[PDB]
Amino acid sequence: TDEEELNDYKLRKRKTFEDNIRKNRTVISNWIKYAQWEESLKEIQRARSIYERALDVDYRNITLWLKYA
Amino acid sequence: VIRMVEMQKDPMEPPRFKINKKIPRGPPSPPAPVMHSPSRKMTVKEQQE
Amino acid sequence: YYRFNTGPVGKGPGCGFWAAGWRVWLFFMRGITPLLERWLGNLLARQFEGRHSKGV
Amino acid sequence: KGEGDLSQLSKQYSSRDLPSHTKIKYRQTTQDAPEEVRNRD
Amino acid sequence: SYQKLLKYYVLNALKHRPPKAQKKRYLFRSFKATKFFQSTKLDWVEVGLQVCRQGY
Amino acid sequence: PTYETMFAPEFGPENPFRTQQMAAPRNMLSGYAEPAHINDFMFEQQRRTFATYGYALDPSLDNHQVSAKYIGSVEEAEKNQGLTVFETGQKKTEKRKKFKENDASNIDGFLGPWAKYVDEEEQKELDEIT
Ligand SMILES: O=P(O)(O)O[C@H]1[C@H](OP(=O)(O)O)[C@H](OP(=O)(O)O)[C@H](OP(=O)(O)O)[C@@H](OP(=O)(O)O)[C@H]1OP(=O)(O)O
Numbered sequence: 598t599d600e601e602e603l604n605d606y607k608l609r610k611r612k613t614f615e616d617n618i619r620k621n622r623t624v625i626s627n628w629i630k631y632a633q634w635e636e637s638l639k640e641i642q643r644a645r646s647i648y649e650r651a652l653d654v655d656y657r658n659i660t661l662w663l664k665y666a
Numbered sequence: 667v668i669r670m671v672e673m674q675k676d677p678m679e680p681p682r683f684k685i686n687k688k689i690p691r692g693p694p695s696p697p698a699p700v701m702h703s704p705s706r707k708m709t710v711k712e713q714q715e
Numbered sequence: 716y717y718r719f720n721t722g723p724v725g726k727g728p729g730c731g732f733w734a735a736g737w738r739v740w741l742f743f744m745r746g747i748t749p750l751l752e753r754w755l756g757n758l759l760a761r762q763f764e765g766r767h768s769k770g771v
Numbered sequence: 772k773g774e775g776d777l778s779q780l781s782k783q784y785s786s787r788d789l790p791s792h793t794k795i796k797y798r799q800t801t802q803d804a805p806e807e808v809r810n811r812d
Numbered sequence: 813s814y815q816k817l818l819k820y821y822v823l824n825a826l827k828h829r830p831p832k833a834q835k836k837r838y839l840f841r842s843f844k845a846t847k848f849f850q851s852t853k854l855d856w857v858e859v860g861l862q863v864c865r866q867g868y
Numbered sequence: 869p870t871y872e873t874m875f876a877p878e879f880g881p882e883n884p885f886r887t888q889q890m891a892a893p894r895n896m897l898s899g900y901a902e903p904a905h906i907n908d909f910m911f912e913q914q915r916r917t918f919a920t921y922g923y924a925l926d927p928s929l930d931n932h933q934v935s936a937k938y939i940g941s942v943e944e945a946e947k948n949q950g951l952t953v954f955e956t957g958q959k960k961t962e963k964r965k966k967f968k969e970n971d972a973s974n975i976d977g978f979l980g981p982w983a984k985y986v987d988e989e990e991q992k993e994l995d996e997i998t
Binding site: 674676677678 | 842843846847848849
């Protein structure tokens, strides 16, 4: 049950961090730490959409744009 | 050419479909360029003030 | 009831002049029909399509 | 084309939202109506 | 009872405002044009037992 | 307005980069639709004509600019010589005689318009399916 524990760990972390960004839609540390956690997986086609919907609530900050760039 | 009439809605009906959905707000209108004044930084001491 | 009892008629029941209470409890429903009509319409809305928690 | 809950999506015939005062009183000529505003000093 | 019906009759005669409604409707003629409502001539007790049956 | 302005064709190779469906004119993603005010009676008459015998005339304005033909099942139009459903035909063929009882006096014998007509191995497979 290695795949079960792997998907369980990833699903718990994704659910906790999606509840975190659902609770606070202002501070931008949560989206960038979640998206760099997916960047640690090194093969993603979904983290670009995360940075794309993370700049809709705040496009005036430099940190999110420079980190995604 | 075809014929288009309307079915009569009887006035003995509650609202049929559950209007209780809640989604997060989507992407808004796309951001215009921001075009402020040239941003300045004061000193090392007035920031300490 | 105190106009049946005038004369040698009797104290017991038999008071069957009913139109006066009938008119005022028609006057009740005459004004309450749109009120609890709207209330039961709101009840059918709250039951069948659900409530609105943070809408209005 | 898909408005809010106030338009069509609700049968909540709510209290305080009724056709009360369905006519607008207009300021007539003896008060400070804009026809007498456009010329007074 | 005399003086309290005098009170209620004076309170009804004092607030006798004119019926300033602009349009008029009936709500029975609008039901009858619909295919789901039909007109028939029945007995009284059938109508009463029918509406209490439907209310239950 | 001038007929020459709308009659002037478009200079080009028809642009075959698109397919036959997408290069076709439309306003809805499925066909150019527009309301009109056609009479009801002849509409429903030719509708019932095509529903019964399977032939009707062809409604359009600018397909070929000359059109007076029949559509659907072709041979049954000239077989019946173009009759309608509201017209008494030239013959009364294959007619079907019912029985009537319209005295309204007898019990369990009155059969007027509610009358039944004078005329009035698969189970093993259906058991094996279910
Ligand atoms: O007790 P009283 O003040 O003297 O009035 C009563 C009383 O009427 P009210 O209480 O409404 O004033 C009775 O009604 P109940 O409330 O006791 O049911 C009524 O009898 P009805 O129900 O037939 O109307 C009749 O009393 P009675 O049974 O003797 O007819 C009547 O007046 P009297 O007691 O003076 O007759």
